[PDB]
């Protein structure tokens, strides 16, 4: 009786309701996405030349933070022990001009900047920049550079507003204005919080009387954005596979206690 309802797909992002689960599982899904789902990211940079205005260390950080396409069809991204495969992203540039992510040349076409338009560093005339940047699989829990995106989640709820509440009409109007479902009866309006609702200060006094927010048990609204390493739906799939792999391996380790 677990169900997903996909509500909205937007650039690099998705909003869905998951039902028939619970708070620990919702917490675990969010954490797994942020902390465990792996990506390729620049991890080490060998500079050969840098005549730019910036430190090696600053350029290396900017390279680390470029989202790299991560080929989930090639590498097992739910693996507990990640493939140590290293990709070389190289640059050999001379000013004048801006160096962009798109100027990086990859040893492996499957792993390169998802966005070619990210400015890295401007070079003046005569200034050279030459390096080999080494990208590897890693996890957000190790360094932010490997985190695949961002996760926002909330209880699915119904906000009940009694028509005894003066100007309840403003709350129906606000909900409609922001695309929240509203059901209207003789007694009340009911607002489904597929997004956060911001109760105007005017109505705070009515909380606990005329206005009540009721959680829908077992249902949660997730909003997920990818940085571009992975499609947002694949991020979710990988996270769920990771929980299967972890639990399976833990059972195997438990059996060794028996012995």
């Amino acid at each position: 009786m677990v169900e997903f309802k996909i509500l909205e797909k937007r650039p690099d992002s998705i909003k869905f309701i998951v039902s028939g689960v619970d708070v620990p599982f919702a917490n675990a899904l969010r954490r797994t996405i942020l902390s465990e789902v792996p990506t390729f990211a620049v991890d080490e940079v060998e500079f050969l030349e840098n005549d730019s205005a910036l430190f090696d260390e600053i350029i290396a950080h900017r390279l680390a933070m470029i989202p790299l396409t991560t080929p989930h069809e090639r590498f097992s991204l739910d693996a507990l022990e990640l493939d140590d495969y290293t990709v070389t992203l190289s640059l050999e540039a001379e000013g004048p001009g801006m160096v962009y992510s798109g100027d990086l040349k990859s040893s492996d076409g499957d792993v390169k900047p998802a966005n070619p338009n990210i400015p890295i560093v401007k070079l003046a005339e005569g200034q050279r920049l030459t390096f080999n940047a080494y990208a590897r699989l890693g996890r957000g829990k190790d360094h932010a550079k490997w985190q695949p995106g961002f996760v926002y989640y909330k209880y699915l709820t119904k906000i009940h507003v009694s028509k005894d509440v003066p100007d309840w009409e403003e709350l129906k109007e606000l909900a409609e204005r922001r695309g929240l479902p509203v059901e209207e009866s003789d007694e009340e309006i009911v607002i489904t919080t597929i997004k956060a609702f911001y109760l105007p200060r005017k109505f705070e006094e009515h909380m606990g009387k005329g206005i009540r927010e009721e959680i829908v048990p077992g249902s949660f609204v997730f909003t997920v954005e990818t940085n571009g390493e992975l499609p947002v739906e694949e991020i979710v799939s990988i996270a769920l596979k990771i929980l299967m792999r972890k639990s399976d391996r833990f059972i195997n380790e438990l059996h060794k206690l028996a012995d």
Partner: protein, 94 residues
Amino acid sequence: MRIEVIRREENLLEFYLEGEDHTFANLLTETLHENEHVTFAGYTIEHPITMARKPRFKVVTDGKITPEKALEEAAQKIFDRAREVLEAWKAAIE
């Protein structure tokens, strides 16, 4: 991943789980709480800001099941539920 047993006494097991962190540790502990025969399950983080970082679990039962069997049952639940959720996810997206 590696289990290191720290302490054993009647109906009690304390252990490290190398290779894991809050994600699995919290889910495992919360799942254990579903079992009426588990009288305590909790964890703390050891070596929180170095590479030696690992969760330290304590699991206590009422004796009608061992800590080890409670742990296996909880881990199996996690596996089964993740499987079910993945199937529902694939049904929605493919």
